[PDB]
Amino acid sequence: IQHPWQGKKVGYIGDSITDPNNIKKYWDFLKEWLGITPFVYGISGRQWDDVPRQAEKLKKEHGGEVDAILVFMGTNDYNSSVPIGEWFTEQEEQVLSAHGEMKKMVTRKKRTPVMTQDTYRGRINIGITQLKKLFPDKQIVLLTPLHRSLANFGDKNVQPDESYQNGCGEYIDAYVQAIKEAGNIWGIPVIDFNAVTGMNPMVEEQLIYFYDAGYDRLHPDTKGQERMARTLMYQLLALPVAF
């Protein structure tokens, strides 16, 4: 058997942990190991509300080339205190239904996805919708956000470690779980990177995988990026690219 992602062209959507612009990124290792041509759209500080824009740029510049897409986003939504929100809104409706006898109008509760940039769930609904609309025939995979600790970049950018809830009373857990739940909600594969990478900066001995123990226990260093890449390599073995 051969690796299904070997020699494929892949679009990478995300934040600074994916952003090309001191640290060699995971997609660069995959390029070397599996010959995967990378189309990187991840940008520093971006959140799930930026998924549609990144997807659109990918479509515009490489629509006829890209084979698969990986979405690694969400840690910034947590940091920016983006309210989790709701997946759907629901209400009674009347609809034609038939199961053995003449069809007739019946009352059935109907749900409608909440399409808003105001909430995390809303952003995920909008993002996945756009991804499927633009790339309906491609392999699209979501990766959950990594564990994170303290990060201090100046007097206007101070991020407490993950033992703290953010400004809207949520732990990073809610931002990780929403992505995992999106798998069944929208019908899309999810790689639980948060867990499978085995990287947790809350355990100081594992800070060997992060940028600087003194002020940045959020961004992985090259060593962490390589462990992420190797993890992704075997986790992707379970998903085809060419159908």
Phi-psi region of 81 (alpha: psi -120 to 50; beta: other; left: phi over 0): left
Q: Which is nearer to a second copy, 36 or 199 (CB)?
A: 199
Q: Is 242 in the site for a second copy (CB under 8 A)?
A: yes
d(CA 171, CA 96): 43
Residue 115 in contact with a second copy, rule: CB under 8 A: no
Number of residues that bind a second copy (CB under 8 A): 101
Check residue 64 for interaction with a second copy (CB under 8 A).
Answer: no
**216-220 sheet: strands from edge to edge:** 151-152, 216-220, 210-212
Q: How far is CA 129 from each of CA 81, 136, 222, rounded to the nearest angstrom?
A: 23, 10, 33
Does position 60 interact with a second copy (CB under 8 A)? The reply is no
Comparing CB distances to a second copy, the nearer of 75 and 139 is: 139
Nearer to a second copy, 39 or 171 (CB): 171
Please state the closest distance from residue 232 (CB atom) to a second copy, in A: 9
Give the Cα separation of 37 and 31 in Å (integer).
Answer: 6
For residues 193-222, which are near a second copy according to CB under 8 A? 194-200, 202-206, 208
> At a CB cut-off of 8 Å and minimum separation 6, what does 31 contact?
37, 38
Comparison of 37 and 177: residue with beta carbon closer to a second copy:
177
By CB under 8 A, tell whether 32 contacts a second copy. no
